[PDB]
UniProtKB/Swiss-Prot annotation, chain B:
It is linked to Hypobetalipoproteinemia, familial, 1: A disorder of lipid metabolism characterized by less than 5th percentile age- and sex-specific levels of low density lipoproteins, and dietary fat malabsorption. Clinical presentation may vary from no symptoms to severe gastrointestinal and neurological dysfunction similar to abetalipoproteinemia. Induction: Up-regulated in response to enterovirus 71 (EV71) infection (at protein level). Apolipoprotein B is a major protein constituent of chylomicrons (apo B-48), LDL (apo B-100) and VLDL (apo B-100). Apo B-100 functions as a recognition signal for the cellular binding and internalization of LDL particles by the apoB/E receptor. It is found in: Cytoplasm; Secreted; Lipid droplet. It comes from the Eukaryota. Interacts with PCSK9. Interacts with MTTP. Interacts with AUP1. Interacts with CIDEB. This is Apolipoprotein B-100.
Amino acid sequence: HSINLPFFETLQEYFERNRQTIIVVLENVQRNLKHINIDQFVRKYRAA
Amino acid sequence: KLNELSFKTFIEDVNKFLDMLIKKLKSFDYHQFVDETNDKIREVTQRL
Amino acid sequence: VSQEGLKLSNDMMGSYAEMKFDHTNSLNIAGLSLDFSSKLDNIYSSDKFYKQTVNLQLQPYSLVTTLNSDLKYNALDLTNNGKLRLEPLKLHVAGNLKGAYQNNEIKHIYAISSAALSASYKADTVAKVQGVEFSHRLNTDIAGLASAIDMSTNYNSDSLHFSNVFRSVMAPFTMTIDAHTNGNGKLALWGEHTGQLYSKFLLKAEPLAFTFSHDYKGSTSHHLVSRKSISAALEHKVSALLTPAEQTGTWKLKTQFNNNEYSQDLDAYNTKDKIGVELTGRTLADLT
Amino acid sequence: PEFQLPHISHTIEVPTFGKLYSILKIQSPLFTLDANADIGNGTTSANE
């Protein structure tokens, strides 16, 4: 017999929400990284 | 990995790996492991 | 003393009547090596004397030590010899010790060596006194780490002979025990006493699962004076399979005295589905 | 025997108790006993 509780359901829901938000943040970070090319960073370093 | 992760699936994967490790340990053979150790010692000696 | 090195030699000879004492010590110094020898013999009588001989040699990266001494007292004798070779990370210790008085003699063998950073040890002790032998052997290759143990203890006598053999290994994870014992007991004081021994023990263990079984049979018949025929026949065997998912055990106890017997049947059960035990106490008794 | 662990998920597992029964038998010409004592759970419904 399986015992499930509303606390388990809320836990899973909040876990899913937090994972989604963190995935969004990670995608933002990846896009920001790709936004500024490494060669442009080297160019700025060379100018400095 | 963040997208892959899920609490129920995470615990399921951990239990799977633990069962695999238990099966490996219970079937552990000291002669085979000793030969593997000799192989690794020979590898380290050959490397250095 | 010279640029080559020190040299020291001394001899002290003293003797009168049965006593002669010849003592010499040769101490030589040469480069990065030492040579020494002390050969001392103390004769008090032909069969009553003492001998000592110590010889040490030091050379770069090697040690050699020899120790030989001899003692005699006519009817009694004792001899001992110990070899010691040592060099970086390699040890080799071997020798003999032997004490004897007429027929009754004891033989001992000792040899300890260390190679590949693993220590090996073998010892053999045998005693033969008044026509009775004792053979207990500690076998070779007790490594010291991830080690193993083997043994062979044997006692032999007319009234009793005893044989014991054991083997076990202490490898990192898995455990095993192979114990087998046999003993025949024959004794006549106030009638014959046939002491029979059948004892077997075996144990195996491994991660998250343990099991074992004891197998013993005990039977003894006493033909005591006054026409008393007494037979004590105890028979117990044990076993149990242990692991987190399933757990159970069994214990068969059979005991009887002459015409009176009791037998109990036990089985212990502990598993996901159920837990339960079953008992059958059956008795046979005499007298009103 | 090999190790057995039932899988693990976010839910709790419970093997429901069904019955308890005592079986006793005594055989002797002096006296005979046969006593049975049994008690179990009411598994008809969860609400009851």
